[PDB]
mmCIF file of C-alpha atoms and ligand atoms in Angstrom:
data_model
loop_
_atom_site.group_PDB
_atom_site.id
_atom_site.type_symbol
_atom_site.label_atom_id
_atom_site.label_comp_id
_atom_site.label_asym_id
_atom_site.label_seq_id
_atom_site.Cartn_x
_atom_site.Cartn_y
_atom_site.Cartn_z
ATOM 1 C CA UNK W 1 0.396 0.482 0.203
ATOM 2 C CA UNK W 2 1.729 3.288 -1.134
ATOM 3 C CA UNK W 3 0.288 6.520 -2.379
ATOM 4 C CA UNK W 4 1.303 9.735 -4.090
ATOM 5 C CA UNK W 5 0.455 13.356 -3.577
ATOM 6 C CA UNK W 6 -2.708 12.993 -5.967
ATOM 7 C CA UNK W 7 -4.121 10.922 -3.868
ATOM 8 C CA UNK W 8 -4.652 7.784 -5.894
ATOM 9 C CA UNK W 9 -2.930 3.416 -4.984
ATOM 10 C CA UNK W 10 0.018 2.649 -6.636
ATOM 11 C CA UNK W 11 -0.902 -1.043 -7.915
ATOM 12 C CA UNK W 12 1.541 -3.539 -10.763
ATOM 13 C CA UNK W 13 0.396 -6.231 -13.181
ATOM 14 C CA UNK W 14 -0.001 -9.476 -10.340
ATOM 15 C CA UNK W 15 -1.008 -7.390 -6.687
ATOM 16 C CA UNK W 16 -4.159 -8.617 -5.191
ATOM 17 C CA UNK W 17 -7.031 -7.800 -3.740
ATOM 18 C CA UNK W 18 -9.375 -8.745 -0.970
ATOM 19 C CA UNK W 19 -7.526 -12.025 -1.342
ATOM 20 C CA UNK W 20 -9.171 -13.558 -4.479
ATOM 21 C CA UNK W 21 -8.899 -10.841 -7.249
ATOM 22 C CA UNK W 22 -5.944 -10.357 -9.457
ATOM 23 C CA UNK W 23 -4.628 -7.894 -11.510
ATOM 24 C CA UNK W 24 -3.803 -9.119 -15.209
ATOM 25 C CA UNK W 25 -4.555 -6.094 -17.101
ATOM 26 C CA UNK W 26 -5.014 -2.330 -17.615
ATOM 27 C CA UNK W 27 -9.210 -1.028 -19.114
ATOM 28 C CA UNK W 28 -9.150 2.850 -18.309
ATOM 29 C CA UNK W 29 -8.658 5.554 -16.205
ATOM 30 C CA UNK W 30 -9.884 8.652 -15.390
ATOM 31 C CA UNK W 31 -10.299 11.438 -13.085
ATOM 32 C CA UNK W 32 -11.573 9.364 -10.134
ATOM 33 C CA UNK W 33 -8.710 6.874 -10.609
ATOM 34 C CA UNK W 34 -7.985 3.285 -12.125
ATOM 35 C CA UNK W 35 -10.029 1.053 -13.987
ATOM 36 C CA UNK W 36 -7.948 -2.744 -13.834
ATOM 37 C CA UNK W 37 -8.401 -5.954 -15.258
ATOM 38 C CA UNK W 38 -8.996 -8.444 -12.915
ATOM 39 C CA UNK W 39 -8.953 -12.569 -12.238
ATOM 40 C CA UNK W 40 -11.446 -13.779 -9.018
ATOM 41 C CA UNK W 41 -9.672 -16.670 -7.737
ATOM 42 C CA UNK W 42 -12.557 -17.001 -5.402
ATOM 43 C CA UNK W 43 -15.454 -17.233 -8.511
ATOM 44 C CA UNK W 44 -12.477 -19.949 -10.235
ATOM 45 C CA UNK W 45 -10.661 -17.635 -11.989
ATOM 46 C CA UNK W 46 -13.176 -16.012 -14.394
ATOM 47 C CA UNK W 47 -12.934 -11.946 -16.016
ATOM 48 C CA UNK W 48 -13.877 -8.980 -14.238
ATOM 49 C CA UNK W 49 -13.947 -5.610 -14.469
ATOM 50 C CA UNK W 50 -12.524 -3.504 -11.446
ATOM 51 C CA UNK W 51 -12.567 0.317 -11.070
ATOM 52 C CA UNK W 52 -10.366 1.553 -8.189
ATOM 53 C CA UNK W 53 -11.188 4.685 -6.264
ATOM 54 C CA UNK W 54 -8.749 5.264 -3.834
ATOM 55 C CA UNK W 55 -9.392 8.295 -1.240
ATOM 56 C CA UNK W 56 -9.226 11.609 -1.880
ATOM 57 C CA UNK W 57 -12.826 11.737 -0.880
ATOM 58 C CA UNK W 58 -15.365 13.442 -3.171
ATOM 59 C CA UNK W 59 -13.948 9.718 -5.094
ATOM 60 C CA UNK W 60 -14.860 7.938 -1.923
ATOM 61 C CA UNK W 61 -18.627 9.583 -1.518
ATOM 62 C CA UNK W 62 -19.461 9.171 -5.533
ATOM 63 C CA UNK W 63 -17.922 5.765 -5.319
ATOM 64 C CA UNK W 64 -20.282 4.875 -2.709
ATOM 65 C CA UNK W 65 -23.790 6.880 -4.559
ATOM 66 C CA UNK W 66 -22.298 4.277 -7.630
ATOM 67 C CA UNK W 67 -22.166 1.111 -5.321
ATOM 68 C CA UNK W 68 -25.572 2.452 -4.050
ATOM 69 C CA UNK W 69 -26.925 3.785 -7.684
ATOM 70 C CA UNK W 70 -26.381 -0.727 -8.614
ATOM 71 C CA UNK W 71 -26.992 -1.902 -5.540
ATOM 72 C CA UNK W 72 -30.922 -0.220 -6.657
ATOM 73 C CA UNK W 73 -31.319 -1.398 -9.927
ATOM 74 C CA UNK W 74 -30.699 -4.780 -9.271
ATOM 75 C CA UNK W 75 -32.530 -5.343 -6.579
ATOM 76 C CA UNK W 76 -35.055 -3.783 -9.119
ATOM 77 C CA UNK W 77 -34.355 -6.285 -11.012
ATOM 78 C CA UNK W 78 -34.924 -9.755 -10.737
ATOM 79 C CA UNK W 79 -33.895 -11.959 -13.410
ATOM 80 C CA UNK W 80 -31.290 -9.518 -14.360
ATOM 81 C CA UNK W 81 -33.597 -8.638 -18.061
ATOM 82 C CA UNK W 82 -32.738 -4.906 -18.393
ATOM 83 C CA UNK W 83 -29.459 -4.953 -20.132
ATOM 84 C CA UNK W 84 -27.163 -2.226 -17.382
ATOM 85 C CA UNK W 85 -23.672 -3.190 -16.388
ATOM 86 C CA UNK W 86 -23.937 -5.813 -13.394
ATOM 87 C CA UNK W 87 -22.098 -4.802 -10.031
ATOM 88 C CA UNK W 88 -21.256 -8.607 -8.981
ATOM 89 C CA UNK W 89 -19.088 -6.974 -6.479
ATOM 90 C CA UNK W 90 -17.705 -3.972 -4.685
ATOM 91 C CA UNK W 91 -15.795 -3.538 -1.031
ATOM 92 C CA UNK W 92 -13.321 -0.574 1.098
ATOM 93 C CA UNK W 93 -9.051 -1.074 0.359
ATOM 94 C CA UNK W 94 -7.302 0.970 2.394
ATOM 95 C CA UNK W 95 -9.575 4.288 1.833
ATOM 96 C CA UNK W 96 -9.550 2.776 -1.784
ATOM 97 C CA UNK W 97 -13.078 1.706 -2.947
ATOM 98 C CA UNK W 98 -13.716 -1.191 -5.736
ATOM 99 C CA UNK W 99 -16.346 -2.161 -7.280
ATOM 100 C CA UNK W 100 -16.406 -4.956 -9.981
ATOM 101 C CA UNK W 101 -18.241 -6.119 -12.554
ATOM 102 C CA UNK W 102 -18.746 -8.869 -15.134
ATOM 103 C CA UNK W 103 -16.058 -8.418 -17.948
ATOM 104 C CA UNK W 104 -18.114 -7.775 -20.668
ATOM 105 C CA UNK W 105 -16.767 -7.401 -24.689
ATOM 106 C CA UNK W 106 -15.855 -4.243 -26.658
ATOM 107 C CA UNK W 107 -18.747 -0.956 -26.951
ATOM 108 C CA UNK W 108 -20.369 -0.698 -29.644
ATOM 109 C CA UNK W 109 -17.525 1.951 -31.139
ATOM 110 C CA UNK W 110 -14.836 0.631 -30.818
ATOM 111 C CA UNK W 111 -16.417 -2.286 -32.612
ATOM 112 C CA UNK W 112 -17.472 -0.088 -35.419
ATOM 113 C CA UNK W 113 -13.546 2.137 -35.094
ATOM 114 C CA UNK W 114 -12.145 -2.068 -35.483
ATOM 115 C CA UNK W 115 -15.017 -2.167 -39.098
ATOM 116 C CA UNK W 116 -13.686 0.948 -40.636
ATOM 117 C CA UNK W 117 -16.386 3.164 -39.862
ATOM 118 C CA UNK W 118 -18.160 0.693 -41.906
ATOM 119 C CA UNK W 119 -22.259 0.828 -40.305
ATOM 120 C CA UNK W 120 -24.303 -2.094 -38.498
ATOM 121 C CA UNK W 121 -26.490 -3.727 -40.715
ATOM 122 C CA UNK W 122 -29.600 -2.291 -39.838
ATOM 123 C CA UNK W 123 -30.676 -5.570 -38.114
ATOM 124 C CA UNK W 124 -28.408 -5.258 -35.601
ATOM 125 C CA UNK W 125 -29.358 -1.742 -35.320
ATOM 126 C CA UNK W 126 -33.256 -2.622 -35.679
ATOM 127 C CA UNK W 127 -31.883 -5.462 -31.855
ATOM 128 C CA UNK W 128 -29.573 -2.563 -30.531
ATOM 129 C CA UNK W 129 -31.789 0.037 -30.732
ATOM 130 C CA UNK W 130 -34.716 -2.067 -29.069
ATOM 131 C CA UNK W 131 -32.929 -2.751 -25.899
ATOM 132 C CA UNK W 132 -31.396 0.429 -25.581
ATOM 133 C CA UNK W 133 -34.763 1.118 -24.901
ATOM 134 C CA UNK W 134 -35.419 -1.783 -23.297
ATOM 135 C CA UNK W 135 -32.885 -0.679 -20.870
ATOM 136 C CA UNK W 136 -33.409 3.396 -20.164
ATOM 137 C CA UNK W 137 -37.674 3.067 -19.992
ATOM 138 C CA UNK W 138 -36.177 0.862 -17.309
ATOM 139 C CA UNK W 139 -34.159 3.366 -15.764
ATOM 140 C CA UNK W 140 -37.036 6.674 -16.419
ATOM 141 C CA UNK W 141 -39.178 4.165 -15.262
ATOM 142 C CA UNK W 142 -37.282 4.575 -11.602
ATOM 143 C CA UNK W 143 -36.521 8.024 -11.379
ATOM 144 C CA UNK W 144 -32.496 7.644 -12.711
ATOM 145 C CA UNK W 145 -31.651 9.801 -16.240
ATOM 146 C CA UNK W 146 -28.374 8.317 -17.830
ATOM 147 C CA UNK W 147 -27.188 11.620 -19.825
ATOM 148 C CA UNK W 148 -24.187 10.483 -20.884
ATOM 149 C CA UNK W 149 -25.268 7.591 -23.128
ATOM 150 C CA UNK W 150 -22.650 7.583 -26.033
ATOM 151 C CA UNK W 151 -21.331 4.430 -28.226
ATOM 152 C CA UNK W 152 -18.581 4.361 -25.764
ATOM 153 C CA UNK W 153 -21.069 3.827 -22.825
ATOM 154 C CA UNK W 154 -22.721 0.865 -25.502
ATOM 155 C CA UNK W 155 -21.118 -2.803 -24.539
ATOM 156 C CA UNK W 156 -21.109 -5.908 -26.203
ATOM 157 C CA UNK W 157 -21.401 -8.847 -24.306
ATOM 158 C CA UNK W 158 -19.354 -10.688 -26.730
ATOM 159 C CA UNK W 159 -17.523 -8.587 -29.462
ATOM 160 C CA UNK W 160 -16.606 -11.915 -30.841
ATOM 161 C CA UNK W 161 -17.671 -11.013 -35.037
ATOM 162 C CA UNK W 162 -17.964 -13.780 -38.384
ATOM 163 C CA UNK W 163 -16.427 -11.532 -40.628
ATOM 164 C CA UNK W 164 -17.706 -11.825 -44.122
ATOM 165 C CA UNK W 165 -17.703 -10.059 -47.358
ATOM 166 C CA UNK W 166 -18.368 -11.268 -50.491
ATOM 167 C CA UNK W 167 -19.267 -9.595 -54.045
ATOM 168 C CA UNK W 168 -19.008 -5.738 -52.466
ATOM 169 C CA UNK W 169 -16.098 -4.494 -54.706
ATOM 170 C CA UNK W 170 -14.536 -4.188 -51.580
ATOM 171 C CA UNK W 171 -15.932 -6.154 -48.967
ATOM 172 C CA UNK W 172 -14.295 -6.878 -46.186
ATOM 173 C CA UNK W 173 -16.815 -6.867 -43.350
ATOM 174 C CA UNK W 174 -17.449 -7.424 -39.501
ATOM 175 C CA UNK W 175 -20.301 -8.952 -38.569
ATOM 176 C CA UNK W 176 -20.291 -9.589 -34.710
ATOM 177 C CA UNK W 177 -21.964 -12.836 -33.458
ATOM 178 C CA UNK W 178 -24.112 -11.708 -30.413
ATOM 179 C CA UNK W 179 -25.568 -8.300 -30.757
ATOM 180 C CA UNK W 180 -27.043 -8.434 -27.200
ATOM 181 C CA UNK W 181 -25.995 -4.604 -25.669
ATOM 182 C CA UNK W 182 -25.598 -3.068 -21.645
ATOM 183 C CA UNK W 183 -25.575 -0.512 -20.432
ATOM 184 C CA UNK W 184 -22.661 1.163 -18.787
ATOM 185 C CA UNK W 185 -22.418 4.746 -17.956
ATOM 186 C CA UNK W 186 -17.532 5.612 -17.103
ATOM 187 C CA UNK W 187 -17.953 8.977 -15.315
ATOM 188 C CA UNK W 188 -22.851 20.743 -19.421
ATOM 189 C CA UNK W 189 -25.116 17.565 -19.209
ATOM 190 C CA UNK W 190 -23.495 14.487 -22.420
ATOM 191 C CA UNK W 191 -21.059 14.758 -25.430
ATOM 192 C CA UNK W 192 -21.277 16.759 -27.357
ATOM 193 C CA UNK W 193 -22.616 14.546 -30.489
ATOM 194 C CA UNK W 194 -25.375 13.418 -28.134
ATOM 195 C CA UNK W 195 -26.398 16.297 -26.922
ATOM 196 C CA UNK W 196 -30.082 17.455 -27.215
ATOM 197 C CA UNK W 197 -30.862 21.042 -27.797
ATOM 198 C CA UNK W 198 -32.524 21.997 -24.583
ATOM 199 C CA UNK W 199 -29.244 21.049 -23.267
ATOM 200 C CA UNK W 200 -27.278 23.332 -25.930
ATOM 201 C CA UNK W 201 -29.921 26.088 -25.017
ATOM 202 C CA UNK W 202 -29.667 26.224 -21.122
ATOM 203 C CA UNK W 203 -33.675 25.401 -21.108
ATOM 204 C CA UNK W 204 -33.285 22.531 -17.767
ATOM 205 C CA UNK W 205 -33.641 18.774 -19.411
ATOM 206 C CA UNK W 206 -35.057 15.084 -18.194
ATOM 207 C CA UNK W 207 -35.916 11.535 -19.314
ATOM 208 C CA UNK W 208 -36.502 12.998 -23.338
ATOM 209 C CA UNK W 209 -32.574 14.332 -22.652
ATOM 210 C CA UNK W 210 -31.723 10.139 -24.006
ATOM 211 C CA UNK W 211 -34.460 9.501 -26.112
ATOM 212 C CA UNK W 212 -32.322 12.287 -27.826
ATOM 213 C CA UNK W 213 -29.662 10.983 -27.952
ATOM 214 C CA UNK W 214 -30.299 6.877 -28.429
ATOM 215 C CA UNK W 215 -32.016 8.974 -31.696
ATOM 216 C CA UNK W 216 -27.590 10.367 -32.423
ATOM 217 C CA UNK W 217 -27.142 6.588 -31.522
ATOM 218 C CA UNK W 218 -28.883 4.373 -33.750
ATOM 219 C CA UNK W 219 -28.216 7.199 -36.777
ATOM 220 C CA UNK W 220 -24.158 6.704 -36.630
ATOM 221 C CA UNK W 221 -24.456 2.543 -35.876
ATOM 222 C CA UNK W 222 -26.872 3.397 -39.175
ATOM 223 C CA UNK W 223 -24.458 5.222 -41.643
ATOM 224 C CA UNK W 224 -21.043 4.499 -39.288
ATOM 225 C CA UNK W 225 -20.488 7.829 -38.812
ATOM 226 C CA UNK W 226 -21.704 10.273 -36.173
ATOM 227 C CA UNK W 227 -25.363 12.617 -37.331
ATOM 228 C CA UNK W 228 -23.998 16.398 -35.533
ATOM 229 C CA UNK W 229 -20.544 16.314 -36.697
ATOM 230 C CA UNK W 230 -19.110 19.456 -35.165
ATOM 231 C CA UNK W 231 -17.516 21.245 -31.458
ATOM 232 C CA UNK W 232 -19.703 24.239 -31.248
ATOM 233 C CA UNK W 233 -23.259 25.615 -30.600
ATOM 234 C CA UNK W 234 -24.236 27.932 -32.721
ATOM 235 C CA UNK W 235 -22.227 24.952 -35.819
ATOM 236 C CA UNK W 236 -24.643 21.897 -34.241
ATOM 237 C CA UNK W 237 -28.104 23.914 -33.880
ATOM 238 C CA UNK W 238 -27.369 25.338 -37.059
ATOM 239 C CA UNK W 239 -27.182 21.903 -38.526
ATOM 240 C CA UNK W 240 -30.137 20.431 -36.501
ATOM 241 C CA UNK W 241 -31.845 22.963 -38.421
ATOM 242 C CA UNK W 242 -31.030 22.020 -41.979
ATOM 243 C CA UNK W 243 -30.906 17.683 -41.417
ATOM 244 C CA UNK W 244 -34.585 18.184 -38.901
ATOM 245 C CA UNK W 245 -36.126 21.248 -40.136
ATOM 246 C CA UNK W 246 -37.006 25.218 -37.707
ATOM 247 C CA UNK W 247 -36.760 25.351 -33.968
ATOM 248 C CA UNK W 248 -39.636 25.703 -31.992
ATOM 249 C CA UNK W 249 -40.552 30.308 -31.198
ATOM 250 C CA UNK W 250 -40.780 28.946 -27.541
ATOM 251 C CA UNK W 251 -37.550 27.589 -27.562
ATOM 252 C CA UNK W 252 -35.663 30.469 -28.733
ATOM 253 C CA UNK W 253 -37.924 33.146 -26.830
ATOM 254 C CA UNK W 254 -36.262 30.595 -22.947
ATOM 255 C CA UNK W 255 -33.633 31.095 -24.107
ATOM 256 C CA UNK W 256 -31.595 33.267 -21.854
ATOM 257 C CA UNK W 257 -28.132 33.109 -24.585
ATOM 258 C CA UNK W 258 -29.582 34.824 -26.835
ATOM 259 C CA UNK W 259 -26.457 35.692 -28.743
ATOM 260 C CA UNK W 260 -26.506 33.317 -31.204
ATOM 261 C CA UNK W 261 -29.903 34.521 -32.822
ATOM 262 C CA UNK W 262 -30.951 37.453 -33.989
ATOM 263 C CA UNK W 263 -34.997 38.662 -35.663
ATOM 264 C CA UNK W 264 -35.559 35.079 -34.917
ATOM 265 C CA UNK W 265 -32.969 33.885 -36.448
ATOM 266 C CA UNK W 266 -29.630 31.555 -36.220
ATOM 267 C CA UNK W 267 -27.070 34.325 -37.106
ATOM 268 C CA UNK W 268 -25.042 31.867 -39.479
ATOM 269 C CA UNK W 269 -21.891 32.898 -41.882
ATOM 270 C CA UNK W 270 -23.235 30.716 -45.277
ATOM 271 C CA UNK W 271 -20.320 31.072 -46.737
ATOM 272 C CA UNK W 272 -17.130 30.824 -44.435
ATOM 273 C CA UNK W 273 -15.328 27.329 -43.487
ATOM 274 C CA UNK W 274 -17.835 25.997 -41.589
ATOM 275 C CA UNK W 275 -20.097 27.426 -43.794
ATOM 276 C CA UNK W 276 -18.798 25.040 -46.925
ATOM 277 C CA UNK W 277 -18.884 22.584 -44.426
ATOM 278 C CA UNK W 278 -22.415 22.273 -44.139
ATOM 279 C CA UNK W 279 -22.752 23.377 -47.520
ATOM 280 C CA UNK W 280 -20.846 20.138 -48.627
ATOM 281 C CA UNK W 281 -22.412 17.200 -45.864
ATOM 282 C CA UNK W 282 -25.768 18.596 -44.102
ATOM 283 C CA UNK W 283 -28.618 16.860 -46.084
ATOM 284 C CA UNK W 284 -32.201 16.825 -44.432
ATOM 285 C CA UNK W 285 -32.659 13.594 -42.609
ATOM 286 C CA UNK W 286 -34.614 11.249 -44.902
ATOM 287 C CA UNK W 287 -31.572 11.440 -48.053
ATOM 288 C CA UNK W 288 -29.527 9.797 -45.389
ATOM 289 C CA UNK W 289 -31.304 6.457 -45.929
ATOM 290 C CA UNK W 290 -28.959 3.630 -47.524
ATOM 291 C CA UNK W 291 -31.898 2.026 -49.200
ATOM 292 C CA UNK W 292 -35.194 2.569 -50.627
ATOM 293 C CA UNK W 293 -37.052 -0.151 -48.306
ATOM 294 C CA UNK W 294 -39.630 -0.643 -45.392
ATOM 295 C CA UNK W 295 -37.484 -0.884 -42.574
ATOM 296 C CA UNK W 296 -35.142 2.008 -43.920
ATOM 297 C CA UNK W 297 -38.002 4.000 -43.856
ATOM 298 C CA UNK W 298 -39.626 2.605 -41.216
ATOM 299 C CA UNK W 299 -36.291 3.431 -38.953
ATOM 300 C CA UNK W 300 -36.091 7.251 -40.091
ATOM 301 C CA UNK W 301 -39.526 7.069 -38.591
ATOM 302 C CA UNK W 302 -38.368 6.697 -35.391
ATOM 303 C CA UNK W 303 -35.162 8.481 -35.462
ATOM 304 C CA UNK W 304 -37.122 11.961 -36.498
ATOM 305 C CA UNK W 305 -39.305 11.222 -33.321
ATOM 306 C CA UNK W 306 -36.848 10.460 -31.535
ATOM 307 C CA UNK W 307 -35.275 13.663 -32.732
ATOM 308 C CA UNK W 308 -38.116 16.084 -31.879
ATOM 309 C CA UNK W 309 -36.536 19.364 -31.007
ATOM 310 C CA UNK W 310 -38.895 20.001 -28.272
ATOM 311 C CA UNK W 311 -38.291 17.532 -25.163
ATOM 312 C CA UNK W 312 -42.472 17.782 -25.120
ATOM 313 C CA UNK W 313 -43.249 16.717 -27.871
ATOM 314 C CA UNK W 314 -40.467 13.793 -27.967
ATOM 315 C CA UNK W 315 -41.220 10.231 -28.496
ATOM 316 C CA UNK W 316 -41.213 8.530 -24.900
ATOM 317 C CA UNK W 317 -39.132 5.928 -24.713
ATOM 318 C CA UNK W 318 -42.512 3.047 -23.720
ATOM 319 C CA UNK W 319 -43.866 5.039 -27.833
ATOM 320 C CA UNK W 320 -40.913 2.978 -29.189
ATOM 321 C CA UNK W 321 -40.672 -0.145 -27.739
ATOM 322 C CA UNK W 322 -44.310 -0.336 -29.818
ATOM 323 C CA UNK W 323 -43.870 1.651 -32.809
ATOM 324 C CA UNK W 324 -43.528 -0.859 -36.505
ATOM 325 C CA UNK W 325 -39.740 -0.668 -36.545
ATOM 326 C CA UNK W 326 -39.425 -3.615 -34.306
ATOM 327 C CA UNK W 327 -42.176 -5.335 -35.415
ATOM 328 C CA UNK W 328 -39.382 -6.848 -37.525
ATOM 329 C CA UNK W 329 -36.694 -8.664 -34.483
ATOM 330 C CA UNK W 330 -36.457 -12.501 -34.189
ATOM 331 C CA UNK W 331 -38.904 -13.703 -30.732
ATOM 332 C CA UNK W 332 -35.802 -14.761 -29.654
ATOM 333 C CA UNK W 333 -34.295 -10.748 -29.671
ATOM 334 C CA UNK W 334 -37.972 -10.471 -28.845
ATOM 335 C CA UNK W 335 -35.709 -11.156 -25.138
HETATM 336 C C1 LIG B 1 -27.382 1.467 -14.532
HETATM 337 C C2 LIG B 1 -25.635 2.878 -15.346
HETATM 338 C C3 LIG B 1 -26.585 4.055 -15.396
HETATM 339 C C4 LIG B 1 -25.783 3.073 -17.158
HETATM 340 C C5 LIG B 1 -24.637 3.396 -14.328
HETATM 341 C C6 LIG B 1 -23.227 1.798 -15.198
HETATM 342 C C7 LIG B 1 -22.882 2.716 -13.451
HETATM 343 N N1 LIG B 1 -21.634 2.486 -13.396
HETATM 344 C C8 LIG B 1 -20.690 1.472 -14.633
HETATM 345 O O1 LIG B 1 -20.694 1.160 -15.452
HETATM 346 N N2 LIG B 1 -19.155 1.026 -13.801
HETATM 347 C C9 LIG B 1 -18.398 0.734 -15.274
HETATM 348 C C10 LIG B 1 -16.961 1.194 -14.388
HETATM 349 C C11 LIG B 1 -15.981 0.957 -15.437
HETATM 350 C C12 LIG B 1 -16.300 -0.369 -15.516
HETATM 351 C C13 LIG B 1 -17.250 -0.874 -16.009
HETATM 352 C C14 LIG B 1 -17.231 -2.366 -17.116
HETATM 353 C C15 LIG B 1 -18.900 -2.903 -16.672
HETATM 354 N N3 LIG B 1 -18.943 -3.838 -17.720
HETATM 355 C C16 LIG B 1 -17.514 -4.076 -18.453
HETATM 356 N N4 LIG B 1 -16.885 -5.082 -19.293
HETATM 357 C C17 LIG B 1 -16.271 -3.574 -19.751
HETATM 358 N N5 LIG B 1 -15.445 -3.526 -20.252
HETATM 359 C C18 LIG B 1 -15.297 -1.781 -18.797
HETATM 360 N N6 LIG B 1 -15.393 -1.166 -19.084
HETATM 361 C C19 LIG B 1 -13.831 -0.598 -19.174
HETATM 362 C C20 LIG B 1 -13.964 0.125 -19.866
HETATM 363 O O2 LIG B 1 -14.317 1.638 -19.037
HETATM 364 C C21 LIG B 1 -15.260 0.797 -19.306
HETATM 365 C C22 LIG B 1 -16.417 0.057 -18.765
HETATM 366 C C23 LIG B 1 -16.826 -3.544 -18.369
HETATM 367 C C24 LIG B 1 -18.586 -0.252 -15.591
HETATM 368 N N7 LIG B 1 -23.322 4.139 -13.652
HETATM 369 C C25 LIG B 1 -22.276 5.677 -12.018
HETATM 370 C C26 LIG B 1 -21.428 5.219 -12.480
HETATM 371 C C27 LIG B 1 -21.024 6.654 -12.056
HETATM 372 C C28 LIG B 1 -21.024 6.924 -11.004
HETATM 373 N N8 LIG B 1 -21.318 8.149 -10.400
HETATM 374 C C29 LIG B 1 -22.087 8.592 -9.523
HETATM 375 C C30 LIG B 1 -22.661 8.388 -9.167
HETATM 376 C C31 LIG B 1 -23.171 7.155 -9.876
HETATM 377 C C32 LIG B 1 -22.517 6.398 -10.922
HETATM 378 C C33 LIG B 1 -23.290 5.968 -11.490
HETATM 379 N N9 LIG B 1 -24.426 3.775 -13.395
#
């Protein structure tokens, strides 16, 4: 046991925790501390993720809050059946709160990056979407809101793939063998590209925030690239307007950030570097359909309804789980 003045724990591959956890790898780091891989010698050689949070205090406090959140998700989920990440253990170790999870596979972003940003096929989209909706419905019902939904926070149970590619000129694609996912959270709300306009405009958010993000995420699974490829609010709102249509007067009246607008409209210099990028790449949403086909149109219908500007007219996760799009699930996918 040795601590540095930043507080954090100095651990080495081969160190043991709770006489059952043998560190074998490294999986992450962040504000709060490390995230290592162990084999659980108690539960018999099997593999876990272990977020370590040492001293600091706010860290320890927030770790407790996380554990509680995850405790409550288990209690409220009997059969594991709501597709959130599952805490298998937690403990206290010379001040360092630790939280063990079953080790899942690559997240939906990584997998996409490993596939050279070749989009997932429409059935995978459909299945992943169904589970994201189910999962966040369950969370919303228990007065919980993710707020930082994004592809990196969706993990595949198993990210093994069957590489398969013929005929297509440069066919070289990986289909993941099993599209089951789990929702995690690594820990202005949201990440830029998944952030909804009410957060951008500082109008307060609630559950409808998660739906907007889901909307954004589905698009990315479907095209391989992000729907809003930008890093600044004004551009982002302009992009919203050209992809989706105008912004309700009512949301412009309530913005205290009265800098992006002028006389009811977004200030926007159509002929700049930013101007040209938007002009030569942002087209109306429907135009990004890859095929002229019912299930693709169903998907864009759910997507448009998920990306309503007004959080109050935006579809709920309950209403989406009943959207025709989800007719095409295999019966097995249905659970
Ligand atoms: C259920 C919900 C809502 C989605 C959630 C999940 C988590 N925690 C989490 O995902 N933790 C976590 C932390 C570290 C690893 C993994 C993880 C679980 N399997 C894995 N299988 C493989 N790799 C993993 N990753 C390692 C790299 O890195 C991403 C996950 C993992 C998961 N939280 C959460 C998080 C932080 C909080 N802070 C304060 C208050 C409340 C908090 C709640 N809420």
